[PDB]
Amino acid sequence: MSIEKIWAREILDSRGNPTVEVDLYTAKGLFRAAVPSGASTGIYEALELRDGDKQRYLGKGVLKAVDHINSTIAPALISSGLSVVEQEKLDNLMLELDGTENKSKFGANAILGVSLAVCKAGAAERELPLYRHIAQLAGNSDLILPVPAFNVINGGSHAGNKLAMQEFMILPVGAESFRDAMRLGAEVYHTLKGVIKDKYGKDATNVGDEGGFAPNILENSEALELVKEAIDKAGYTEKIVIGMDVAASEFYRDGKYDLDFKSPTDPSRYITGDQLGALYQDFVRDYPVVSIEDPFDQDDWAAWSKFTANVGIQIVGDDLTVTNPKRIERAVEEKACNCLLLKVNQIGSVTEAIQACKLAQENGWGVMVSHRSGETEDTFIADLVVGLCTGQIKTGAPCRSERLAKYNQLMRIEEELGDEARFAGHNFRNPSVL
Amino acid sequence: MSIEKIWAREILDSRGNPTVEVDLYTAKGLFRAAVPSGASTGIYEALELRDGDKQRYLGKGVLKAVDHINSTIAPALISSGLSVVEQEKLDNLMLELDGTENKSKFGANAILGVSLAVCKAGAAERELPLYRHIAQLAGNSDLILPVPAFNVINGGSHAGNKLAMQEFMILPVGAESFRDAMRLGAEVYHTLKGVIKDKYGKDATNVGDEGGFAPNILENSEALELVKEAIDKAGYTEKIVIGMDVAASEFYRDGKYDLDFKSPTDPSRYITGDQLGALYQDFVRDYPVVSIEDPFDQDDWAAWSKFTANVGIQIVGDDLTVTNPKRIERAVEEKACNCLLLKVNQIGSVTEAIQACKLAQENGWGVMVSHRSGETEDTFIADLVVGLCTGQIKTGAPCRSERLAKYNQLMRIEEELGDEARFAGHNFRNPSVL
Ligand SMILES: [Cl-]
Ligand SMILES: [Cl-]
Ligand SMILES: [Mg+2]
Ligand SMILES: [Mg+2]
């Protein structure tokens, strides 16, 4: 039925920075959701609203976004009399009320927070589990549990090591179930900790923002060997496969790519995108690498299209698609990649995230639901990846509970589905065949 | 009313290790609670039950504890027809079915999981928030919000550095509210990150299990100077004081203490308890140290009593008391300390945890509700510290959401209390005066 009350507030995300949380009240009770960390800048992605008061949290407060929800958005959604099940009606109503392209008036963080609470409220109004309600919102009926991608080795701008490539992930594609995929990822993560401890010292086992280790490693080959070693030490050689998030936009320097970018700028090491693909092909031929994210710059479309047709593995767009539908339309016709990274807070609403996913799915693309580096204890994307039938989610290492809360919820979803549960397994790119 | 169903399962904690989760159903719905990591061996404390299957999670599985809940504990509590408000009855009934003193048959994790879920369900049966139901179980009426103690610098066993003492904490005693205390902690925490990255390098900024930093330093005095420097640069010298957990059992050897342990062994550097107390005295005099946990070994009673009687600061028992009433009785008699650390899973029952807290407060002790090194997304202890009117809690750095979940939940309790909300402030040791 109607929305009776909406109250928002400030909370701290997994890094100690402010973010938006929204309580939405209907007749059925309280429905709470929180928003992961995004960017208040950028041409394409929707922008979170930050206060900018440097005395307070060094300008990262979200008091203005919280106020936009409580004072302006709440009375508008209450007056509409719309049922909480009408997800697209409510999301479009807040889109026009904001009236901007990138949601810059209220902030993508303010709009998403209400949109997520609406969906949870509409799921209980439907007497459905959240993942089921999302599936009906997306026109799906056969549900699937995704293959998790655990960030276990970090580099690039994320860590103090000279390692240029951002994320080295593990995919338990050979697991019996999702709960079994957790045991595989967790045991390999614990094995990797001992490998790093013995090889690099006891001080090298502390973790980054999403729970992965950051040993002072120069070259990515040793990162892949390190992961490869831990998989084999744990005894899961053919059950677990490696995925990569290069984030090559971070070290695109002077037209070339600098995988020694923590150094004083020096022309001596930078190589061309063509030569970068040769290292990738050597990565793919030497290592079980099935997925590479941001292999080139967000505007170096020539190398992107040239790499996708040349290769057969999954190439996922993060910085070049920014969950932006019109940018995705370009990458389709340009065949720059074959997989979409779905950061719901980069687009700002549940409706637009569903349509962005279905847009990629109708074009034979894969989709990978993604966390943010700044997360909360919210577990919405766990139900999201099940209802969207995406088949693949990355939401951190099996360490730090802003990551495990999603993984734990996916295990609860599998247990609830029971015999109707399907694990994507080796079909994480196209789970619609199971 | 009667319990309809109790279903237990295995989830991953913040380190990636399995732990117990319990779903309890009544006519008012589902009530969920997860257990933090405890200990499986120990002479005094309640013991968690581990599977021991070295092939599965390296023996860390809790399938046996889960089976004890689903097969044995659940049928008996439902058969009793006891109302879920009867916390003491249901906890007692589980204590006798287990039949052992340290909860070693069913496991302290199995018994606590049910006990927590019973408490959340009892609060809804009373149509009260959880913290207010805990207050009525403890015989309290006027609630208090605690001063947070944020772990910020780490040494001891769980750190790769040379630093002997375990934790260095910050306490925003001068804050205006709990929410302001979260702002002060986060701003100092982020400030110290900058001071560490500038002095020790960008690779020294990663975090341990509790969310704090662990730079490679040997002198405990340097750690205190680091924290003091971060407090001053944030501009909060007036408002933030320092607490310590030395965890002296870790470097207690034959009859001395080795502050250069986790190093090549040399008994010549060993220092006596008097020498260690003199080092503490210089800390209190040179730094705003207001609290010291485990200053001496778990059985060095003479050092405890002598140091407590010759000092004015708070002296916290952790390994000394292990949340055990008989150990607390001896600690009160010999005046070994003046503050109890309350780890709920170290005692294994809500009813007994309330007893252990009311025993300490009756003797003029302070109480500090505590997290564990392995936490979950559960937030029970946030409502617990408020309901027990304890005035102080340590549940991590303002980093990693297994820590922020309690801190955010305390912020929610503060705004729900409205004008009735009181911040312990400078009376965190004796909040009853407010
Ligand atoms: Cl990110
Ligand atoms: Cl602990
Ligand atoms: Mg990325
Ligand atoms: Mg301790």
HEC string of A31-75 equals EEEECCCCCCCCCCCCCCCCCCCCCCHHHCCCHHHHHHHHHHHHH
Amino acid at A59: G
* B313: nearest Cα among B334, B288, B330: B288
Q: From CA B7, how far away is CA B30, in angstroms rounded?
A: 10
Alpha carbon of B288: minimum distance to chain A alpha carbons (Å): 24
Q: Are A24 and A118 in contact (CB under 8 A)?
A: yes
Q: Are A131 and A381 in contact (CB under 8 A)?
A: no
| Cα B168 → chain centroid | 14
Answer whether A204 touches B (CB < 8 Å): yes
- At A301 the three-state DSSP class reads helix
**Other CB atoms closer than 10 Å to residue B127's CB: what's the count?**
9
**Other CB atoms closer than 10 Å to residue B58's CB: what's the count?**
15
- At B367 the three-state DSSP class reads strand
Q: Are A309 and A332 in contact (CB under 8 A)?
A: no
Token pair, residue B4, equals 């309809």
CA dist A250 → A155, A256, A262, A293, B394 (Å)? 11, 12, 11, 13, 38
> Which of B13, B15, B381 to substitute to test the interface with A, most A CBs within 10 Å?
B15
Task: Indicate the helix (H) or strand (E) that contains B5.
Answer: strand B5-12
- Tell me the pairing of strands A150-154 and A167-171: antiparallel
Q: From CA B163, how far away is CA A343, in angstroms rounded?
A: 40
Number of residues assigned to chain B: 434
Contact B160 A205 (CB under 8 A): yes
Q: Are A407 and A418 in contact (CB under 8 A)?
A: no
Question: Residue B40 annotated as binding?
Answer: yes
Name the maximum alpha-carbon separation found in chain B: 66
Contact B57 A402 (CB under 8 A): no
Q: Which residues of A touch B189 (CB under 8 A)?
A: 16
Ligand nearest to C-alpha B42: 2
Answer whether A377 touches B (CB < 8 Å): yes
**Other CB atoms closer than 10 Å to residue B270's CB: what's the count?**
19
Question: Residue B60 annotated as binding?
Answer: no
User: Which residues lie across from A9 on neighbouring strands?
Assistant: A21
Token pair, residue B343, equals 């780890």
- At A173 the three-state DSSP class reads coil
Interface of B with A in 316-345 (CB under 8 A): none
Residue A63 exposed, middle or buried by CB count within 10 Å (0-12, 13-18, 19+): middle
Q: Are B289 and B243 in contact (CB under 8 A)?
A: yes
**Half-sphere exposure at residue A374, Cβ-oriented, CA atoms within 13 angstroms:** 21
Q: From CA B87, how far away is CA B91, in angstroms rounded?
A: 6
Question: Residue A133 annotated as binding?
Answer: no
**Other CB atoms closer than 10 Å to residue A374's CB: what's the count?**
23
Question: Is B103 known to be catalytic?
Answer: no
- At A313 the three-state DSSP class reads coil
* A163: nearest Cα among A284, A230, A244: A244
Token pair, residue B171, equals 């306490």
Q: From CA B393, how far away is CA A194, in angstroms rounded?
A: 32
Q: From CA A249, how far away is CA A295, in angstroms rounded?
A: 9
Question: Is A343 known to be catalytic?
Answer: yes
Please report which residue ranges of B273-340 form alpha helices under DSSP H.
Answer: 273-286, 301-309, 325-333
Question: Residue B426 annotated as binding?
Answer: no
- Tell me the pairing of strands A314-317 and B289-293: unpaired
Q: CA A398, A403, A405 angle in degrees (round to 5)?
A: 105
Measured in degrees and rounded to the nearest 5, phi and psi for residue B271 equal -120, 155
Contact A11 B415 (CB under 8 A): no
Q: Are B85 and B362 in contact (CB under 8 A)?
A: no
Token pair, residue B429, equals 């040791």
Q: Are A398 and A150 in contact (CB under 8 A)?
A: yes
Task: Indicate the helix (H) or strand (E) that contains A289.
Answer: strand A289-293
B120, B228, B343, B406: which is the annotated catalytic residue? B343
Q: From CA A114, how far away is CA A72, in angstroms rounded?
A: 12
Number of residues assigned to chain A: 434
Q: Which domains does chain A have, with CATH numbers?
A: 1-127 (3.30.390.10), 128-434 (3.20.20.120)
User: Which residues lie across from B317 on neighbouring strands?
Assistant: B340
* Contacts of A96 by beta carbon, 8 Å cutoff, 6+ apart: none
Alpha carbon of A204: minimum distance to chain B alpha carbons (Å): 8
Q: From CA B146, how far away is CA B393, in angstroms rounded?
A: 6
- At A339 the three-state DSSP class reads strand
| Resolution, Å (one decimal) | 2.3
| Cα B90 → chain centroid | 24
Measured in degrees and rounded to the nearest 5, phi and psi for residue B75 equal -60, -30
* Contacts of A421 by beta carbon, 8 Å cutoff, 6+ apart: A143, A145, A177, A178, A413, A414
Q: Are A223 and A130 in contact (CB under 8 A)?
A: no
* A306: nearest Cα among A336, A284, A268, A350: A336
Q: From CA B392, how far away is CA B370, in angstroms rounded?
A: 9
- The radius of gyration of chain B's CA atoms, rounded to the nearest angstrom, is 21
- Tell me the pairing of strands A29-34 and A18-26: antiparallel
Alpha carbon of A236: minimum distance to chain B alpha carbons (Å): 12
Q: Which residues of A touch B57 (CB under 8 A)?
A: 183, 186-187
CA dist A15 → A36, A117, A210, A229 (Å)? 11, 23, 10, 30
Measured in degrees and rounded to the nearest 5, phi and psi for residue B291 equal -150, 140
Measured in degrees and rounded to the nearest 5, phi and psi for residue A341 equal -85, 120
Cα A370 to ligand 1 centre (Å): 9
* B397: nearest Cα among A203, A50, A212, A207: A207
Q: In what order do the strands lie in the sheet with B289-293?
A: B147-148, B392-394, B366-370, B339-342, B314-317, B289-293, B241-245, B167-171, B150-154
- Tell me the pairing of strands B29-34 and B18-26: antiparallel
Q: Which residues of A touch B11 (CB under 8 A)?
A: 404, 408, 411
| Cα B151 → chain centroid | 11
Contact B21 A402 (CB under 8 A): no
Token pair, residue B331, equals 């600690």
- Residues lying with their CB under 5 A of ligand 4, a single-atom ion: B 245, 318
Question: Residue A245 annotated as binding?
Answer: yes
- Tell me the pairing of strands A29-34 and B339-342: unpaired
Answer whether B293 touches A (CB < 8 Å): no
Cα A201 to ligand 2 centre (Å): 23
* Contacts of A133 by beta carbon, 8 Å cutoff, 6+ apart: A119, A122, A123, A126, A387
* B111: nearest Cα among B78, B74, B152, B157: B74
What separation, in Å, do the N-terminal and C-terminal C-alpha atoms of chain A show? 36
Alpha carbon of A400: minimum distance to chain B alpha carbons (Å): 5
Q: From CA B171, how far away is CA B293, in angstroms rounded?
A: 14
User: Which residues lie across from B366 on neighbouring strands?
Assistant: B339
Q: From CA B374, how far away is CA A275, in angstroms rounded?
A: 45
Contact A401 B377 (CB under 8 A): yes
Eight-state DSSP code of residue B4: -
Q: Are B261 and B164 in contact (CB under 8 A)?
A: yes
Which of A57, A404, A415 lies nearest to residue B12, judging by beta carbons? Answer: A404
Q: From CA A46, how far away is CA A324, in angstroms rounded?
A: 8
Nearest CA in chain B to A213: B206
Q: From CA B283, how far away is CA A240, in angstroms rounded?
A: 51
Q: Which residues of A touch B415 (CB under 8 A)?
A: 9
Amino acid at B179: R
* Contacts of A333 by beta carbon, 8 Å cutoff, 6+ apart: none
> Which of B400, B407, B415 to substitute to test the interface with A, most A CBs within 10 Å?
B400
Helix axes A350-362, A130-137, angle to 10 degrees: 60
Helix axes A301-310, A273-286, angle to 10 degrees: 30
Q: From CA B292, how far away is CA B315, in angstroms rounded?
A: 5
CA dist A33 → A6, A116, A282 (Å)? 12, 6, 43
* Contacts of A427 by beta carbon, 8 Å cutoff, 6+ apart: A391, A433, A434
Long-range Cβ pairs for the range B48-57 (8 Å, 24+): B48/B107, B48/B108, B48/B109, B48/B345, B49/B104, B49/B105, B49/B106, B49/B107, B49/B108, B49/B109, B49/B110, B56/A183, B57/A183, B57/A186, B57/A187, B57/B17, B57/B18
Token pair, residue A268, equals 């001596």
- At A98 the three-state DSSP class reads helix
Q: From CA A320, how far away is CA A294, in angstroms rounded?
A: 8
Task: Indicate the helix (H) or strand (E) that contains A152.
Answer: strand A150-154
Amino acid at B98: D
Token pair, residue B263, equals 């190093």
List residues in chain A that are followed by a break over 2.5 Å (C to N).
none
Q: From CA B171, how far away is CA B426, in angstroms rounded?
A: 10
- The radius of gyration of chain A's CA atoms, rounded to the nearest angstrom, is 21
Interchain CB contacts (distance < 8 Å): A and B: 132
Contact B401 A400 (CB under 8 A): yes
Q: From CA B96, how far away is CA A76, in angstroms rounded?
A: 56
Interface of B with A in 208-237 (CB under 8 A): 208, 214, 216
DSSP string, A342-407: E-HHHH-SHHHHHHHHHHHHHTT-EEEEE--SS--S--HHHHHHHHTT--EEE---S-SHHHHHHH
* A359: nearest Cα among A394, A395, A399, A317: A317
Instruction: State the Cα torsion B304-B306-B309-B315 to the nearest 10°.
Output: -20
E strands, B95-230, in order: 147-148, 150-154, 167-171
Q: Are B410 and B383 in contact (CB under 8 A)?
A: no
Q: From CA A401, how far away is CA B13, in angstroms rounded?
A: 7
- At A196 the three-state DSSP class reads helix
Interface of A with B in 404-423 (CB under 8 A): 404-405, 407-408, 411-412, 415
Q: From CA B385, how far away is CA B394, in angstroms rounded?
A: 10
